[PDB]
Amino acid sequence: AEDCERIRKELEKNPNDEIKKKLEKCQA
Numbered sequence: 713a714e715d716c717e718r719i720r721k722e723l724e725k726n727p728n729d730e731i732k733k734k735l736e737k738c739q740a
Contacts, residue, residue: 714738 716738723731 714734716735719731719735719738722728723735
């Protein structure tokens with residue numbers, strides 16, 4: 713239950729570590 717592009721948006725507004733890391737492997 714995740715969305716890479718949505719997390720991208722969240723990573724855009726919030727340059728967060730966990731968000732970034734879970735973005736990279738959102739699709740895993």
